[PDB]
């Protein structure tokens, strides 16, 4: 039987270099094919073409690199919304309508300080890259947006090196205070945007700096009866006020964007400061009795606004402070699923990994989580499983479960629930999910299993993946074929033959510098009967370590733990190859950023940790599409704002 | 705050209308940018004295004035030929 899978990325990017992988099976006479992108809906104007040689030494697998340049598309009155990925050879001629996008590249705007004062200069430079993660060398048009949404300054600049240094934006002697916004933009052909926020705050200096440092930054079930708040005031480095007069007031708030606050006009305390520190308490339940609220079921996702005026005894000065909100939380935890696809494989174990985050996103360990499950098989017969508990470990905040499912499972309805020792079971965090089995005619499955799931993959080493089929036609399988995706681009492919009567085998794959932030690996095989054939596929999401292509490191000489004001030091930069290094020395007391790989990974198409409902959903959720004889894609190209996690 | 954009302007009204860009030992297209820099900085300085109805108030947060708006439109109506 003669079939073929021609794998393309899900969405062509204009100006990119998309790799189109064709793999044919069941052939003996070598041949050639022309992969060409034609226009729509006419197939007249051919944007680019390629020529691949499908011969025996290539194991009948090759790849052409196609490219849609922006200078060949009719802009103005419309953008182009579809193209045709068309393949022609002497054995097949297919074509598929492919959406295109113009979202090419990345723009990182980096101002030095997040908070500015009047008559200071906003330094700003833009790190511009294209979608193959190289210096884009395109012109960028910065825009300065005030709090009033006005184009107060639109400066543009040409790029040569990848780092676009702009002139310094001068905050006036009297500015409009509030959140500003810098919007970067390529001047032509691309709808790439970058956004950076900064704040302009008026500088007034106090007689003494009053801080309010409370017990916890959220209140649930234990600070709902007593909440110890600490107030500190000092003139300078160590000059601390001796006596002062403290007046506190409290109020309930809905959210931090609605600035109306309903004060509790009975809880106005009055204490005395003794050489800096006064510890006050706030019984919350008896104080919220006006504007009744009566419970912790109510006040849920509401805030507490603590205002403090410390009046100095000696000089008579009165410095004010405030907290915008301490969230009145019901349960102290939030549960989610880290790196669990909600798709089953029948006869194959299902690993679940939940994560207990507190209500201000910390990995709270030592928190007992309980899992209850329900097998709803094909005949709509709910069967209950044994409950299993586990402990959230403190290193990454992830508890671990494994369900060994019966052979005829169709829908798993599992509900996680915290089992903390000193909370009621209406203040325990719970979540409920539902996992659906992979569907296939002539029921045959694939389960690829990453060996070291717990630790991140090191570049230069070798990935070892164990591949198990669960077919009824196991001895008809001949090859395992895989694809490796990174940043929505197919970077590898291959074909390991199946060891004839070994029930499962292992594939060895080298991990390179193509797949640095993360990567996906889609393995499949073809089980052919007397009917039409079918691809049986599965995919995983990998976790390759952060090792940049030429390792920059900076040092200070001499490296001491204390310097002198005025000491001349030397900065020792050392890269691996030639590079343009951008430097920024920011006073670190402003922070109270530059995380990039959690944003540079948003070029990846498709979400989740793999899996799919059928064959084509595995290809679609990996960020791929394809055209075969065996199966069709038939995948609705809708929005799907998916929210999966994938990482501790 | 309007007297910080005026002497940059009446220099720029001279070197451009009279065409006197042959004085500088630097690149005169570069030194033209630093003058148009300050004409753009000083245009921002009374962005803050503008009210919600696009009217100009004398002090910060004070009442609007017909005197300052006529002086804000005299100054800004002259920069238009050199800064958009």
Swiss-Prot record, chain B:
Q: How is its activity regulated?
A: Membrane attack complex (MAC) assembly is inhibited by CD59, thereby protecting self-cells from damage during complement activation. MAC assembly is also inhibited by clusterin (CLU) chaperones that inhibit polymerization of C9.
Per UniProt, subcellular location reads as:
Secreted; Target cell membrane
Q: What's the subunit arrangement here?
A: Complement C5b is composed of complement C5b and complement C5 beta chains that are associated via disulfide bonds. Component of the membrane attack complex (MAC), composed of complement C5b, C6, C7, C8A, C8B, C8G and multiple copies of the pore-forming subunit C9. Interacts with the tick complement inhibitors OmCI, RaCI1 and CirpT1. Interacts with cobra venom factor (CVF).
Function noted in UniProt? Component of the membrane attack complex (MAC), a multiprotein complex activated by the complement cascade, which inserts into a target cell membrane and forms a pore, leading to target cell membrane rupture and cell lysis. Complement C5b is generated following cleavage by C5 convertase and initiates formation of the MAC complex: C5b binds sequentially C6, C7, C8 and multiple copies of the pore-forming subunit C9.
Name the UniProt record assigns to this protein: Complement C5b
Native species: Homo sapiens (Human)
Q: Which gene encodes it?
A: C5
């Amino acid at each position: 039987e003669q079939t073929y899978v021609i794998s393309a990325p899900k969405i062509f990017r204009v100006g990119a270099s998309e790799n189109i992988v064709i793999q044919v099976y069941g052939y003996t006479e070598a041949f050639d094919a022309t992969i060409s992108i034609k226009s729509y809906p006419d197939k007249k104007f051919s944007y680019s073409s390629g020529h691949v040689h499908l011969s025996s030494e290539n194991k009948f697998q090759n790849s052409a690199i196609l490219t849609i340049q922006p200078k060949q598309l009719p802009g103005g009155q419309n953008p182009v919304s579809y193209v045709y990925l068309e393949v022609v050879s002497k054995h097949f001629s297919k074509s598929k309508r492919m959406p295109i996008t113009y979202d090419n590249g990345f723009l990182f705007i980096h101002t030095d300080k997040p908070v500015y004062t009047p008559d200071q200069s906003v330094k700003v430079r833009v790190y511009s890259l294209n979608d193959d993660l190289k210096p884009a060398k395109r012109e960028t048009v910065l825009t300065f947006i005030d709090p009033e949404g006005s184009e107060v300054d639109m400066v543009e600049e040409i790029d040569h090196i990848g780092i676009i240094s702009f002139p310094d934006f001068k905050i006036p002697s009297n500015p409009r205070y509030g959140m500003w916004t810098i919007k970067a933009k390529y001047k032509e052909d691309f709808s790439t945007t970058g956004t950076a926020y900064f704040e302009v705050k008026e500088y007034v200096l106090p007689h003494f700096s009053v801080s309010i440092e409370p017990e916890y930054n959220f209140i649930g079930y234990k600070n709902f009866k007593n909440f110890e708040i600490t107030i500190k005031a000092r003139y300078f480095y160590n000059k601390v006020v001796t006596e002062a007069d403290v007046y506190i007031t409290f109020g309930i708030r809905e959210d931090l964007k609605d600035d109306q606050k309903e004060m509790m006009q009975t809880a106005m305390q009055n204490t005395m400061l003794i050489n800096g520190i006064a510890q006050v308490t706030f019984d919350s339940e008896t104080a919220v009795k006006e504007l009744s609220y009566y419970s912790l079921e109510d006040l849920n996702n509401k805030y507490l606004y603590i205002a403090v005026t410390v009046i100095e005894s000696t000089g008579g000065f009165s410095e004010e402070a405030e907290i915008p909100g301490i969230k009145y939380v019901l349960s102290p935890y939030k549960l989610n699923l880290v790196a669990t696809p909600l798709f089953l494989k029948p006869g194959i174990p299902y690993p679940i990994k939940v994560q207990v985050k507190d209500s201000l996103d910390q990995l709270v360990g030592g928190v007992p989580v309980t899992l209850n499950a329900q097998t709803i098989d094909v005949n709509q017969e709910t069967s209950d499983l044994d409950p299993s508990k586990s402990v959230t470990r403190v290193d990454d905040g992830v508890a671990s479960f494994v369900l060994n499912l019966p052979s005829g499972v169709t829908v798993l309805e599992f509900n996680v629930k915290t089992d903390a020792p000193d909370l009621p079971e209406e203040n325990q965090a719970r979540e409920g999910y539902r996992a659906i089995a992979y569907s296939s005619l002539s029921q045959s499955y694939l389960y690829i299993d990453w060996t070291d799931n717990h630790k991140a993959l090191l570049v230069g080493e070798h990935l070892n993946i164990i591949v198990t089929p669960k077919s009824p036609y196991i001895d008809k399988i001949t090859h395992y074929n895989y694809l490796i995706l990174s940043k929505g681009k197919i970077i590898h492919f291959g074909t390991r033959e199946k060891f004839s009567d070994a029930s499962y085998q292992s594939i060895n794959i080298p991990v390179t510098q193509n797949m640095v932030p993360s990567s996906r690996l889609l393995v499949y095989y073809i089980v052919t009967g007397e009917q039409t054939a079918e691809l049986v596929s599965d995919s995983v999401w990998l976790n390759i370590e952060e090792k940049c292509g030429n390792q920059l490191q900076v040092h200070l000489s001499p490296d001491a733990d204390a310097y002198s004001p005025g000491q001349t030091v030397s900065l020792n930069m050392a890269t691996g190859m030639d590079s343009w290094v951008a430097l920024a020395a920011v006073d670190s007391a402003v922070y109270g950023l530059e995380r990039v790989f959690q944003f540079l990974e948003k070029s990846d198409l498709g979400c989740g940790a793999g899996g799919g409902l059928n064959n084509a959903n595995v290809f679609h959720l990996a960020g791929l599409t394809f055209l075969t004889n065996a199966n069709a894609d038939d995948s609705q190209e809708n929005d799907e704002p998916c929210k999966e996690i994938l990482r501790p | 705050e309007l007297m910080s954009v005026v002497p940059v302007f009446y220099v720029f009204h001279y070197l451009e209308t009279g065409n006197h860009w042959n004085i500088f030992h630097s690149d005169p297209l570069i030194e033209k940018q630093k003058l148009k820099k300050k004409l753009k900085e000083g245009m921002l300085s009374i962005m803050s004295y503008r009210n919600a109805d696009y009217s100009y108030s004398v002090w910060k947060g004070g009442s609007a004035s017909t005197w300052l708006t006529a002086f804000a439109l005299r100054v800004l109506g002259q920069v238009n030929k050199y800064v958009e």
